[PDB]
Ligand binder design. Structure first.
Ligand SMILES: CC(=O)SCCNC(=O)CCNC(=O)[C@H](O)C(C)(C)COP(=O)(O)OP(=O)(O)OC[C@H]1O[C@@H](n2cnc3c(N)ncnc32)[C@H](O)[C@@H]1OP(=O)(O)O
Ligand SMILES: CC(=O)SCCNC(=O)CCNC(=O)[C@H](O)C(C)(C)COP(=O)(O)OP(=O)(O)OC[C@H]1O[C@@H](n2cnc3c(N)ncnc32)[C@H](O)[C@@H]1OP(=O)(O)O
Lengths: 168, 171
């Protein structure tokens, strides 16, 4: 049983818990053992901001009533760049490779298309993170550049990232 | 041929003049995310930003005063998580009136030297509109290479999307 819907402030405590869990599952994102470093009350503030924002959104995936994944679009408000959404997605490791990430990413893209503001979606992905690269390409993201020392892992060493975007 | 030059780290006391300068340059070009709305920060809010930059070991704001007035700024910004703590996002702007006299280069080099000495930053980066060739040139001169380009990186002229270069330097 799977529901995908937009985050509500009542999800804050459980979202913080989810993000601290996934922070310990991999080193593919900026999240590390220090976790999300946000209180449930800070996260409420965040989720309210996202919900009222015309060019930003947090969508949550629930598996039998518990959050199993999140996709985030954030965006700057200045007119130069307000049409650009920066994407972030993470799925609980035990649920990988069952299509949740594609489901969530497709919902995000649909929302972004409907927004009327967002005309570009983008992100940075570690080149070694081939699952992410493949998923993003599958949904029409292209590799737009590659950057040396785009990330630091394992207490020394530096690794490369790709930049990826999709026009909408 | 006569002038007075000071280059130094910004202090909270500079807040009002720095707000004034950033509002000035935001009206001179549409080459950066600055626009006619201006910097959108009061002198009081800038004073906070400026305390943080001075108090942070992987960030900095450097000012150039020409004849006692701010003529240019270089800004290094950075996240604090260890995944990305070594990456400084660079921003430079010079008053149009003072372009092509070497001021941009002096500031860029000072910023690079600080970044090198910090012991934390191992990469500098920015994005630059592909049409902003003065900027593309200035950065190449100081060892930045083009790592990519992004369609719709910027929106101008109420309806025109344009491309940006991703540019980077290892330090
Ligand atoms: C800024 C950001 O978005 S953060 C970067 C992305 N997030 C992360 O890296 C966090 C950790 N990882 C995750 O949360 C997940 O593994 C995600 C988000 C990458 C993928 O979530 P999932 O729900 O597993 O995705 P889903 O099942 O829809 O699809 C995975 C696809 O990758 C493929 N895949 C899995 N592992 C690999 C691999 N090592 N190499 C290539 N492809 C792979 C699968 O075959 C599948 O493709 P298909 O549908 O064509 O078969
Ligand atoms: C993220 C960011 O940094 S923002 C992007 C940069 N900032 C901006 O676009 C804001 C508006 N522009 C400016 O502030 C300035 O014009 C800057 C910062 C780009 C340059 O600063 P200046 O003080 O003019 O730089 P400086 O005089 O040291 O060097 C200018 C160089 O570009 C050259 N130049 C000037 N116009 C052009 C052009 N159209 N095409 C190519 N080169 C040019 C000059 O010849 C000189 O190069 P050289 O010394 O090798 O001959």
């Amino acid at each position: 049983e799977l529901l995908i819907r937009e985050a509500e402030p009542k999800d804050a405590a459980e979202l913080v818990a989810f993000l601290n869990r996934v922070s310990l599952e991999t080193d593919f994102t900026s999240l590390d053992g220090d976790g999300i470093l946000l209180t449930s009350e800070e996260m409420e503030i965040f989720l309210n901001k996202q919900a009222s924002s015309d060019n930003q959104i947090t969508l949550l995936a629930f598996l039998n009533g518990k959050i199993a994944g999140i996709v985030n679009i954030t965006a700057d408000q200045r007119k130069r760049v307000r049409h650009i959404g920066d994407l972030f997605i993470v799925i609980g490791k035990r649920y990988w490779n069952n299509g949740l990430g594609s489901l969530l990413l497709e919902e995000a893209i649909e929302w972004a298309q409907a927004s009327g503001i967002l005309r570009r979606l983008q992100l940075t992905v570690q080149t070694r993170n081939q699952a992410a690269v493949h998923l993003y390409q599958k949904h029409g993201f292209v590799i737009e550049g590659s950057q040396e020392r785009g990330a630091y892992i394992e207490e020394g060493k530096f690794i490369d990232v790709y930049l990826m975007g999709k026009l909408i």
